[PDB]
Amino acid sequence: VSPPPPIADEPLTVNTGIYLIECYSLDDKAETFKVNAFLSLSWKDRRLAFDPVRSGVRVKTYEPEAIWIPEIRFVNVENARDADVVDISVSPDGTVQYLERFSARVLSPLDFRRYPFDSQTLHIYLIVRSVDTRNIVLAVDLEKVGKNDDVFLTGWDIESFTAVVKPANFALEDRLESKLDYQLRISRQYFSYIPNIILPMLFILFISWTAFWSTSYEANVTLVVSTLIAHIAFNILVETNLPKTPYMTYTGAIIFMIYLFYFVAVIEVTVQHYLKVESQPARAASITRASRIAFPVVFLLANIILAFLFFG
Amino acid sequence: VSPPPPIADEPLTVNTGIYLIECYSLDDKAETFKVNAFLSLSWKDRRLAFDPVRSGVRVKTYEPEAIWIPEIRFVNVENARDADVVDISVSPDGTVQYLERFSARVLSPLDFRRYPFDSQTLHIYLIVRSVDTRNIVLAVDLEKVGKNDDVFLTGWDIESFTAVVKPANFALEDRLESKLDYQLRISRQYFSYIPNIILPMLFILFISWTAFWSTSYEANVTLVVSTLIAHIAFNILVETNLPKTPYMTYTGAIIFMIYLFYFVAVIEVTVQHYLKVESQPARAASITRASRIAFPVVFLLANIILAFLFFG
Amino acid sequence: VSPPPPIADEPLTVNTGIYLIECYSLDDKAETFKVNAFLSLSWKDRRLAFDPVRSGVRVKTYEPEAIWIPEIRFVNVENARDADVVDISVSPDGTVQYLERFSARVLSPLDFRRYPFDSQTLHIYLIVRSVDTRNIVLAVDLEKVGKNDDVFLTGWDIESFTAVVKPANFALEDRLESKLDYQLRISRQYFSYIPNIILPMLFILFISWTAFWSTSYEANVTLVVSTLIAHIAFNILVETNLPKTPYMTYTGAIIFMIYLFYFVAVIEVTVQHYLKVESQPARAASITRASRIAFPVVFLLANIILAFLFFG
Amino acid sequence: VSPPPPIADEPLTVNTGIYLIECYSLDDKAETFKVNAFLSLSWKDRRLAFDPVRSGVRVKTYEPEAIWIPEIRFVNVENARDADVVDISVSPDGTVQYLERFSARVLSPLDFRRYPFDSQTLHIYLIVRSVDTRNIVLAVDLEKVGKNDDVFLTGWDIESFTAVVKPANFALEDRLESKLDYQLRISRQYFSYIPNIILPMLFILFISWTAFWSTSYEANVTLVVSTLIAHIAFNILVETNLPKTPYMTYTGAIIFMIYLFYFVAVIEVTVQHYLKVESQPARAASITRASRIAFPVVFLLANIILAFLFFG
Amino acid sequence: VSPPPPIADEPLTVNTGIYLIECYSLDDKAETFKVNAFLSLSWKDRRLAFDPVRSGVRVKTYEPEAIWIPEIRFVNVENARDADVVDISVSPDGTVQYLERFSARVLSPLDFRRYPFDSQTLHIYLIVRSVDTRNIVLAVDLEKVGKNDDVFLTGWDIESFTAVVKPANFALEDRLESKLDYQLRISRQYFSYIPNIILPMLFILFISWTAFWSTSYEANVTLVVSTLIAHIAFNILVETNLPKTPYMTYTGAIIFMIYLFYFVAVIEVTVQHYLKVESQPARAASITRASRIAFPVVFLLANIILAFLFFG
Ligand SMILES: [Cl-]
Ligand SMILES: [Cl-]
Ligand SMILES: [Cl-]
Ligand SMILES: [Cl-]
Ligand SMILES: [Cl-]
Secondary structure, three states: OOOOOOOOOOOEEEEEEEEEEEEEEEEOOOOEEEEEEEEEEEEEOHHHOOOHHHHOOOOEEOOOOOOOOOOEEEOOEOOOOOOEEEEEEEOOOOEEEEEEEEEEEEEOOOOOOOHHHOEEEEEEEEEEEOOOOOOEEEEEOHHHOEEOOOOOOOOEEEEEEEEEEEEEEEEEOOEEEEEEEEEEEEEEOOOOHHHHHHHHHHHHHHHHHHHHHOOOHHHHHHHHHHHHHHHHHHHHHHHOOOOOOOOOOHHHHHHHHHHHHHHHHHHHHHHHHHHHHOOOHHHHHHHHHHHHHHHHHHHHHHHHHHHHHHHO | OOOOOOOOOOOEEEEEEEEEEEEEEEEOOOOEEEEEEEEEEEEEOHHHOOOHHHHOOOOEEOOOOOOOOOOEEEOOEOOOOOOEEEEEEEOOOOEEEEEEEEEEEEEOOOOOOOHHHOEEEEEEEEEEEOOOOOOEEEEEOHHHOEEOOOOOOOOEEEEEEEEEEEEEEEEEOOEEEEEEEEEEEEEEOOOOHHHHHHHHHHHHHHHHHHHHHOOOHHHHHHHHHHHHHHHHHHHHHHHOOOOOOOOOOHHHHHHHHHHHHHHHHHHHHHHHHHHHHOOOHHHHHHHHHHHHHHHHHHHHHHHHHHHHHHHO | OOOOOOOOOOOEEEEEEEEEEEEEEEEOOOOEEEEEEEEEEEEEOHHHOOOHHHHOOOOEEOOOOOOOOOOEEEOOEOOOOOOEEEEEEEOOOOEEEEEEEEEEEEEOOOOOOOHHHOEEEEEEEEEEEOOOOOOEEEEEOHHHOEEOOOOOOOOEEEEEEEEEEEEEEEEEOOEEEEEEEEEEEEEEOOOOHHHHHHHHHHHHHHHHHHHHHOOOHHHHHHHHHHHHHHHHHHHHHHHOOOOOOOOOOHHHHHHHHHHHHHHHHHHHHHHHHHHHHOOOHHHHHHHHHHHHHHHHHHHHHHHHHHHHHHHO | OOOOOOOOOOOEEEEEEEEEEEEEEEEOOOOEEEEEEEEEEEEEOHHHOOOHHHHOOOOEEOOOOOOOOOOEEEOOEOOOOEEEEEEEEEOOOOEEEEEEEEEEEEEOOOOOOOHHHOEEEEEEEEEEEOOOOOOEEEEEOHHHOEEOOOOOOOOEEEEEEEEEEEEEEEEEOOEEEEEEEEEEEEEEOOOOHHHHHHHHHHHHHHHHHHHHHOOOHHHHHHHHHHHHHHHHHHHHHHHOOOOOOOOOOHHHHHHHHHHHHHHHHHHHHHHHHHHHHOOOHHHHHHHHHHHHHHHHHHHHHHHHHHHHHHHO | OOOOOOOOOOOEEEEEEEEEEEEEEEEOOOOEEEEEEEEEEEEEOHHHOOOHHHHOOOOEEOOOOOOOOOOEEEOOEOOOOOOEEEEEEEOOOOEEEEEEEEEEEEEOOOOOOOHHHOEEEEEEEEEEEOOOOOOEEEEEOHHHOEEOOOOOOOOEEEEEEEEEEEEEEEEEOOEEEEEEEEEEEEEEOOOOHHHHHHHHHHHHHHHHHHHHHOOOHHHHHHHHHHHHHHHHHHHHHHHOOOOOOOOOOHHHHHHHHHHHHHHHHHHHHHHHHHHHHOOOHHHHHHHHHHHHHHHHHHHHHHHHHHHHHHHO
16 A cells, blocks of 8 residues: 555664574585575554454454555575465554565575584575655564574584674665674584595505505505595595685695695605615615604694694 | 354364375485375364255355365475365365365485485474464374375385374464374385495405415505505495485494405505515414404404494 | 256266377486377367357357366376467367367386386376266277377387276275376387497406416406406496386396406406415416306306396 | 458468577487577458558557467477567558567487587477468568577587478368478587597507507506506596487497407407417517507508598 | 657657676576676656646655556576566656666676686676657666675676666667667686696696606506596596687696697607617616606796797
């Protein structure tokens, strides 16, 4: 119909609230997730007031096409939400209670600096646009914000679901707008990464390090290059999941360090064989004895330094 | 129109029933499946009673827009169901029979602790919301719950399809709700996993174990590392299907144990060669003779212990 | 409007017919295909009879919303068909001719016991439900069943498209139903499988068998294990297409037999080297000479036996 | 409303024309492509004639629901086209001009006998069905057939877009139909295939051929088998794109020939080693000297013969 | 209703403007992206003028079905946009302000000549078609063109979003059309490509180059061929992302050069062994000493020349 008119100049306040039902399909590469929740709205319309005694009823039920309903939209969605109306009720003083169930796909950036052990915050933005006759603002109803106990995300742990009470008011396309922020905090389940990726990689590296206790050139070459091939296959498998980022991450640094270590091991084997052929066995023995202790200690120190750099 | 009014205060009872027609597209990674079934509803509306003699008919046929129909919704669905109405009939006393055919996608968690030999239970939740004038509850009609004989799931065996008679009543968004639980029990067909994965892996391990009957260092190195590469390829192929879980599974433990065994075999080969070079052949012979018996027995004992731990 | 009334008690007969236009997207893993065809219906309604002389016309054209049309549904479809009405015409005696074009996705199980050389039968089920005032049955019009000459399936040969004349009548949800069966017979084009998979595998096996003409342990080990790795890669590539079945197939048996042969070849090489080291060259020579003839003959006999078992 | 009536018996002629705007998503495996074009129709309706002087206008604009419009359909489409009406105008003599923009997915078979250097023809079929009162035929308007200059297909070169003027008239479902044929000629861009696939394969084969200048059995075995593994990986990568066909193609023949060459090279190495061990060095030298020249010449001759067979 | 009439002959001017909200899903292989933006339109209709004093209002709000709205379409879209109307307001003099929010998928070609370090320009075309009574042209409103500060593309850096003020007027299908061009400039984030692809490839090549400091034929063969296999795997992984182009790119040239270098290294190893066997050690020593310096210098010079050719 038409937005309600003020007494003198006051803005119209709409109280909102979101109750989560389902959360699924978190795509790391596309930075998307899908949601299924309740949307609650409430405002005051004095034109709908009635006398309970004369009417003989306490609550009046309306239809969406029979009264004025504010237009609320989500900002970071791929398309408009698929919503259906559940209930509309009017109090004797004119207060309207609105409820609906929707479904939508949300876009939200992610941070991968600590990819196996990272935490993320997902954002949902609600906006309303002011009409040429009235100014509309948004508020938060704290008793209508929550989530179901059966909400589960495959691979993540859900911590909290709150909202920022203070809205943001600005001007866009020669009109005023109000924005609300709903935040969902999640943590990644990293248990499966240890025995699936972390430990076999260490085993393969330790297997490659056995060339320092041998003097056969062909066996050393075979060991080191074959372990390198296995490392390449594991790196391809891991990289199939991580997206491309404009910064450095923990896993990428570790993989690059492993490549560097393989290169240095090849150089050491080559040097030892060259010295042995040149009839200098003592120097080659000394070099291989040094390397036997040098490689693991440097690996451990570099890993400690990287862990401090990325998590400290 | 409007919900029927009670005599004094009694709640309105709606009898439900689901008859399965199709079941397909069980996605382990997404924890989803698709369904195609009949939905049956029945309640009492005294305002629709008629006299069979005066009307000359026994059953009156209505349209969905001409009478009041309760709003029933599924809880764990990605979107609202696609339904069409099949038949609406009214008995002379006012009893309404409703039938429809729908299609929907259901979300349900799965347990993978015994992944090759596991059984699952799938859940379908039906809910109804009470209106401001009447209270509505849900019931189960046992003669209208069942499934077709041609219902098939690719890779699973269907056991039963029942419903929990007792509903759950609670308060949500300042209104009362009633919930029903439909359970479908399935079992995985594990026949194909044995000759496709289990036995070739054993063959490859046995091939790698042949290095204990040889004294050539290069051949032993080649055998063990190449078998390791084959193991890595098989592990990648198997892991392409299993999702990531916050707990330990049977297959993952077995794979990790195989990696450990390969590492120990490499260490044994390296030790034997080092002892042989150092002019101590008897100690190397003794070690290799011990290992020849030690490896299979330990493998068998560890497999028995793991099987008891996960299935006992 | 309302279903036509009988004279005394006779059921209403609806003559059906399906004319195929397109067939595409046969998914072996999902056991699905898509269709695009014509649906023809015909029945008698005495309330629509007219006099050709008075009206001055021979055929009267109606609209779908102006007369009664029976509700026909497909049983094994994922969703309801997307149909549009092409023509409705009424004969002077009351016979109605109905035509429409639809599109749908069909679910039908497949048998993979002879996967490269198998034949399949696809099923389409038509059902109708009886109303509370009349009983409805289904019939087949043989002059309206057929297919286009340009219907093609990628990888299959289309043989015939017939229908079972006799319908199935039963009771479901306290009402009578009639079901018709349309069958489409197809055969797989197996030409490409021979030079793409069958012959290179034989070449690789023959290459691995060359180790029986050599006495170098390292070369034999390299040959056999590298050919095993190639076999594993080919097996992964083949298995990417075949779904998982609760029974044994031809290809799986062949692959398992090849794995067994590789294991036995490794054992033979190991035995020959062990005998040679132990200063028993005559026994090793005899064993290798025996194996040279033993392996191909056993392979051929096992292949003949398997072929007789699966196709005889 | 109703189709226009003839004077005595003449059929109704509809002039058609298609103007291409976009062409994209050519799927070789599914044999599909997507289109976005204009559809133009024109016919004569004498019931719509008006006097320009009395009306004071030259062109009258109508709505699609206010006049009769023929039903035109595409034959080889997966679903019905998504169309919207752009303009309807009527000339003073009764000639109607119709314009619309649609989008559709087309099915069309492809020929892969010369897959890297092949040319294809894509087909679009337009059909119309005759009503019980009038006969309708199709014609081609040559001034309204064309394509945009920015139409591009990823990986193909567009040559021409014409139409066959002569329609095909036949009887289907007891009615007459008229069919038109629109053809689009395309050519594949084969530039990228040379340096990406063709030349590295030749390099690998030449690398494998170096075993004829050596007398070390182990090195020869390593070279040949490792090059075979690389060939298998390249063949898998190439075959990921080509679909399965009931005939032989150029690429498949070349790959099979390369497999045959690898097998013969293995046999030659094995024979040379066996002769050398048997204290017959001259015969092995002669054989290897012959093979050094024999292999490339036979390869070149076989390639020339295959090229003549497939392209001559 | 009907387009507004001119005074004598002037064309109707429509001022446009696009405000970006979201940009996502840039597919390199399909050459597509998705957008979510505001569309603003403005024109003059003298038939809607009113007197503010008599009406008592300053702005009049209409509905889309109550007034005439020009038909604006996007040219390079896969389907018609999904739009909803936000606001329609009319000034006292007759100026109409129109606003809507849409979503669409755009087709735009890309250039890959400098694929890791390339910049692209994306194009959005707006068109309008003239009616038979009035001529319509398009203009740009510079105060309504812009983008949000939170617009992000995964893997790209957004630089600017402007529009070409001058429209293109031409004739199509016997009517006049006007076209506008909106351009979006983006730059690829190339940081991740260095440590993920560029440096490990250099490490592998350097590892393969170690064969010039050895005289063991078998070890050299193993090193070079295994590094070649690793190169093939890396090349497959890189090529999985780049589409096929009718021209040469930087990455393809580099990969082809690496293949050439591997071939020449194999030839050098083979020559050295052949000379050594023929009792000419000095010539082989000289050749290997030359190659030790020759290979890296030629590699560096070729890389410099290629970089100058593609970027200079
Ligand atoms: Cl929205
Ligand atoms: Cl629902
Ligand atoms: Cl249906
Ligand atoms: Cl169509
Ligand atoms: Cl559009």
